[PDB]
């Protein structure tokens with residue numbers, strides 16, 4: 001809070017944004033952007049019914 | 051041995067038991083491309099941002 | 101005071117990257133920044149600035 005009385009908020013010194021945590025990975029499906037998962041299976045598993 | 055020859059019903063019952071056990075086995079048995087072959091590994095991952 | 105100054109001048113400060121994700125389009129530089137490293141010799145420990 002400044003002596004003039006004006007309030008300094010975070011939005012006045014920074015840009016807040018719902019972004020990502022790890023920014024170093026770009027996944028694209030058939031050129032289109034996308035995000036996927038890799039199912040590494042389990043030790044004792046049924047490769048078909050799973 | 052040779053005492054099954056005199057008792058065909060015993061042999062047939064043993065065959066039926068084998069077939070039943072085999073069917074029960076194939077109904078519930080895991081299927082996979084390959085079993086666990088590689089020696090077990092443990093991976094420790096740590097992250098230091100920047 | 102000596103302990104605090106040793107803690108300050110014997111750190112592993114993570115500088116970061118000079119241009120990294122999310123990077124602006126048309127970016128052709130990618131380097132790491134080395135700000136500080138842990139001291140290695142008693143001579144270096146002798147030159148820690150106390151005041």
Ligand SMILES: CCCCCCCCCCCC
Pocket residue numbers: 051052
């Ligand atoms: C099955 C074990 C090896 C063969 C045993 C033969 C036993 C002699 C013939 C049957 C006598 C009743």
